[PDB]
From Swiss-Prot, chain B:
A motif (Histidine triad motif) lies at residues 229-233. Decapping scavenger enzyme that catalyzes the cleavage of a residual cap structure following the degradation of mRNAs by the 3'->5' exosome-mediated mRNA decay pathway. Hydrolyzes cap analog structures like 7-methylguanosine nucleoside triphosphate (m7GpppG) with up to 10 nucleotide substrates (small capped oligoribonucleotides) and specifically releases 5'-phosphorylated RNA fragments and 7-methylguanosine monophosphate (m7GMP). Cleaves cap analog structures like tri-methyl guanosine nucleoside triphosphate (m3(2,2,7)GpppG) with very poor efficiency. Homodimer. Associates with components of the exosome multienzyme ribonuclease complex, such as EXOSC3 and EXOSC4. Interacts with NDOR1. One of its GO terms (cellular component) is cytoplasm. It comes from Mus musculus. The hydrolytic product 7-methylguanosine diphosphate (m7GDP) efficiently inhibits the decapping scavenger activity and acts as a competitive inhibitor in vitro. Inhibited by 2,4-diaminoquinazoline. PROSITE patterns: HIT_1. This is m7GpppX diphosphatase. The C-terminal histidine triad (HIT) motif and the N-terminal domain are required for the decapping activity. The N-terminus is necessary but not sufficient for binding cap structures. SUPFAM superfamilies: HIT-like, mRNA decapping enzyme DcpS N-terminal domain.
């Protein structure tokens, strides 16, 4: 008899849940007592399973019908209704904070906020980007413009298995050092930016036969690391951070610089931060003061 | 209780989503077309303890020191799948459920004035339902806030599908009183007062009603919009709301600042959006852009 590594399960808290994604993250009390996190996720369908079920006399309860539309509760065989079950036991506070639904706040960072508050904060963290430099200094590179000022490398995202094009995701990392984000972009960077957009699209076209009009090509602000990089995703893939509150289309960044050379130093950029992110309180305090 | 046909043969997967755990199938039957849609149900908080207690049927898949993963095999009454059948299905149904095939368009200001706008001028906007809300002929009791100013005012109404028990999914729409403002393309500094009122008073109204502060809201316009009378979407920052992607959503605060910085921004700049391959506008734009 296969068992969970504890006795009983009482829900203390729903940490996170998504009706959309058919997933729930539970903080349970067990062995009453101890903390455990249990994540339950309904499984995706396998078309062969479904095809075979629909010719095998499925157990159906009719809920509603009109002349052509009918809805049922289907009570499937067990290979369609298994639930992916992830267990963290015992769960620490770190685990509980990890799985807790994010609590985000928007901040509208002015040019002066960035200069006076954000930049100092980032410099105080000065997190390593040595992994970036390791890639640039050199097997996964799909395309490279080796120009040390206007060049870049293009690499598949680690999570893209390349088993399909639906979730195509590549990243361009510039060779040039010290361009921390959008905030550092000036017309000096236009050749670089244009190179990434043009040559990155050319590369993807030649390698995967995906045209540029099927790609969403963007930067994040705030970026996950502070060395300029560009996301190239399938337009049909609702990729990470492709929301308006984080993503900035490269073509539009370029045109923004063309139209206003000082755009990225002067304009207000809007982004989200977790409520426990120290930068959020620094920015909020600064904004309250003026 | 049987399906309303037999001999289902999959012709095509019209759409499937591993993220959303749904599959839409086009089958041939009675050798007619049918569509069958299966959807895994969301978890209900009140049943999860019973899923996990007692002696649930499990198969261990992986375990390291603290993390393990199983397949859990729910009992029958906790196993059901939502199943929808359209039979006989028509071409219309098949097109309805087919996955969207989109292309990005970068519409220059000249593309807009030469191609897009003449197309739009040829179409009735079919917005009497909008007018009915503005005029209190429909949905009046659903209005959460109104600034009744006919130039710079608006009404704020919740999305009909929103279950307001769940602030996570917060979604309201501001519709302006002023008529004739099709989209972002029509926006000039004339509209700044309206835009500013929407942002300010819409946030205020949502703080008052829901005790949700403005910094928890994504407030944006779509381009292209779903209908051609200016409206603004107010959504929970945690809700991946309809069209909040960068290729359709424009934050209201940024729209305002854009206009403050360059009065002709929305007539001059290239706007980037996605269209279905069968959209008549994509046909027009693509052919025209290629000629140019």
């Amino acid at each position: 008899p296969v068992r969970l590594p504890f006795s009983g399960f009482r829900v203390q808290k729903v940490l996170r849940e998504s009706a959309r994604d058919k997933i729930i993250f539970l903080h349970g009390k067990v062995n009453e007592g101890e903390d455990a996190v249990v994540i339950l996720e309904k499984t995706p369908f396998q078309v062969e399973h479904v095809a075979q079920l629909l010719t095998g006399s499925p157990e159906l309860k009719l809920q509603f019908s009109n002349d052509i539309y009918s809805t049922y509760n289907l009570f499937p065989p067990r290979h369609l209704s298994d639930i992916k079950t992830t267990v963290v036991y015992p769960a620490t506070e770190k685990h509980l904070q990890k799985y807790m639904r994010q609590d985000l706040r928007l901040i509208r960072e002015t040019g002066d906020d960035y200069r006076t508050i954000t930049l100092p904060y980032l410099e105080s963290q000065s997190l390593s980007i040595q992994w970036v430099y390791n890639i640039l200094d050199k097997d996964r590179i799909v395309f490279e413009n080796p120009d040390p000022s206007d060049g870049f490398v293009l690499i598949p995202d680690l999570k893209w298995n390349q088993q399909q094009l639906d979730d195509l995701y590549l990243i361009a990392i510039c060779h040039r050092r010290g361009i921390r984000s959008l905030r550092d972009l000036t017309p000096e960077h236009l050749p670089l930016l244009r190179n990434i957009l043009r040559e990155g699209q050319e590369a993807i076209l030649k390698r995967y036969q995906v045209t540029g009009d099927r790609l969403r090509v963007y930067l994040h602000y705030l970026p996950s690391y502070y060395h300029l990089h560009v996301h190239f995703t399938a337009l049909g893939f609702e990729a990470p951070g492709s929301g308006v509150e984080r993503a900035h289309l490269l073509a539009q960044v370029i045109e923004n610089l063309e139209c206003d050379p000082k755009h990225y130093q002067q304009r207000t950029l809007t982004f989200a931060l977790r409520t426990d992110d120290p930068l959020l309180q620094l920015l909020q305090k600064a904004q309250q003061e003026r």
